[PDB]
Amino acid sequence: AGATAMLFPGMGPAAFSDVGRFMVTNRYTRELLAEADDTLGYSLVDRFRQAEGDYSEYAQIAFLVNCVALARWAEQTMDLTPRICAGACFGEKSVAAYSGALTFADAVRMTAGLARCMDEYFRTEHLGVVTHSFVRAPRERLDEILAELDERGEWHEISCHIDHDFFMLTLHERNSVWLEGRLRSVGAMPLYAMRPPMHAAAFGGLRDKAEEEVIAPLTFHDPTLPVVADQDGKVLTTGDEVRTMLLESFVRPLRWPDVISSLQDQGVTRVCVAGPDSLFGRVGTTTRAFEVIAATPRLALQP
Amino acid sequence: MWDAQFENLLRRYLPFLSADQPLEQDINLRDIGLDSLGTVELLSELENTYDVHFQDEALTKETFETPGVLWKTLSQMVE
Numbered sequence: 001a002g003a004t005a006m007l008f009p010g011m012g013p014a015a016f017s018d019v020g021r022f023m024v025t026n027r028y029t030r031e032l033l034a035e036a037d038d039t040l041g042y043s044l045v046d047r048f049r050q051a052e053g054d055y056s057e058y059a060q061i062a063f064l065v066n067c068v069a070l071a072r073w074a075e076q077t078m079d080l081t082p083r084i085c086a087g088a089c090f091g092e093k094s095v096a097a098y099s100g101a102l103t104f105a106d107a108v109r110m111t112a113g114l115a116r117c118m119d120e121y122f123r124t125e126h127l128g129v130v131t132h133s134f135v136r137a138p139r140e141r142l143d144e145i146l147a148e149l150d151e152r153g154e155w156h157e158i159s160c161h162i163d164h165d166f167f168m169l170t171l172h173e174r175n176s177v178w179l180e181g182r183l184r185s186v187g188a189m190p191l192y193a194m195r196p197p198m199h200a201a202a203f204g205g206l207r208d209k210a211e212e213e214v215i216a217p218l219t220f221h222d223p224t225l226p227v228v229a230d231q232d233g234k235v236l237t238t239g240d241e242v243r244t245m246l247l248e249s250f251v252r253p254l255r256w257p258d259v260i261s262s263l264q265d266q267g268v269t270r271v272c273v274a275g276p277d278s279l280f281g282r283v284g285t286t287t288r289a290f291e292v293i294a295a296t297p298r299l300a301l302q303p
Numbered sequence: 304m305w306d307a308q309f310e311n312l313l314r315r316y317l318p319f320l321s322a323d324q325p326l327e328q329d330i331n332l333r334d335i336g337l338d339s340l341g342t343v344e345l346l347s348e349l350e351n352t353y354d355v356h357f358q359d360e361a362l363t364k365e366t367f368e369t370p371g372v373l374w375k376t377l378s379q380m381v382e
């Protein structure tokens with residue numbers, strides 16, 4: 001009676017010690033690494049070992065390999081036949097590969113190119129702008145904080161809707177310490193301040209630079225199964241729409257509740273989250289709606 | 304100075320601590336697997352169990368650094 005969706009998560013802070021041993025021993029990762037290393041002309045696992053930060057270009061490519069491999073590992077070891085798939089933020093990249101909208105080689109090229117593109121853009125543009133995540137923040141409490149920012153003439157945008165009380169707000173870091181104390185003052189808990197920021201109408205120039213330098217050269221195919229857009233849950237069926245999703249990521253917010261309502265409307269009852277993740281598989285938006293399988297490196301490392 | 308009620312509650316959110324390992328006063332909670340959404344669930348369970356509302360300084364990172372600091376913080380609110 002059920003149906004299964006394959007979901008691809010956003011990228012959390014890389015931790016090479018979390019996945020380096022997994023990547024070189026699991027046959028699903030080893031197979032994609034051979035392809036990623038041939039496309040890139042280096043050893044991705046070696047470059048990722050030496051990378052500093054949590055969001056290096058190498059950790060973004062490795063994150064693509066880990067999610068796409070763990071989707072195939074779950075299909076082959078759990079007899080999954082998904083009718084539909086969806087990707088949140090980075091996971092748009094992973095779902096483009098899984099769905100057949102891009103060859104794995106073009107997804108690796110795209111992931112590396114967008115990494116370099118964003119690095120360059122944020123080296124000079126929107127200096128000090130950050131994306132804050134917070135929880136226990138009902139929309140009514142958030143709206144009062146946004147009105148206080150408006151009163152002071154402080155620019156912001158809502159970048160993600162995660163759950164009824166879980167949002168990401170993008171604004172200048174000069175507002176960071178006030179926002180954190182102001183959240184806490186009403187029982188909301190700040191989680192993380194992401195640099196570079198993501199998902200803002202103000203980032204049209206990053207969209208344009210991505211399109212010209214990375215995305216337009218690529219050939220997009222029609223996906224082999226429907227793809228739910230993370231912007232608004234629209235059911236996508238063509239390569240042009242997947243390409244638009246990747247570009248709209250820069251300038252439209254993630255609406256995670258809309259992915260979950262769309263999946264529900266397409267008859268989904270069970271989701272597989274493919275890859276390392278401690279948000280999309282565990283957040284109430286997802287678990288209230290669906291049985292969750294969490295296909296993480298930690299699970300695939302179990303005896 | 305904590306008790307079984309508190310420790311049974313906390314240990315539900317510390318996946319990398321085995322039931323036969325002691326819960327040290329100053330163990331780093333993040334290192335034995337307390338994370339952001341584990342903290343949200345923990346908070347929700349502490350608030351229902353003890354009839355308290357964590358707010359202001361009780362929601363800083365420092366509150367969840369160790370079972371010692373978390374116990375002190377919960378204690379100041381239950382009395």
Ligand SMILES: *CC(=O)NCCNC(=O)CCNC(=O)[C@H](O)C(C)(C)COP(*)(=O)O
Pocket residue numbers: 010011012013088089090131133159160168191192193194198199254278279338339340
């Ligand atoms: C998809 C999107 O736009 N997400 C917001 C921007 N990305 C991030 O903030 C990445 C870091 N995310 C994480 O650290 C986790 O997702 C949490 C839940 C924000 C915090 O986890 P924690 O265990 O401290």
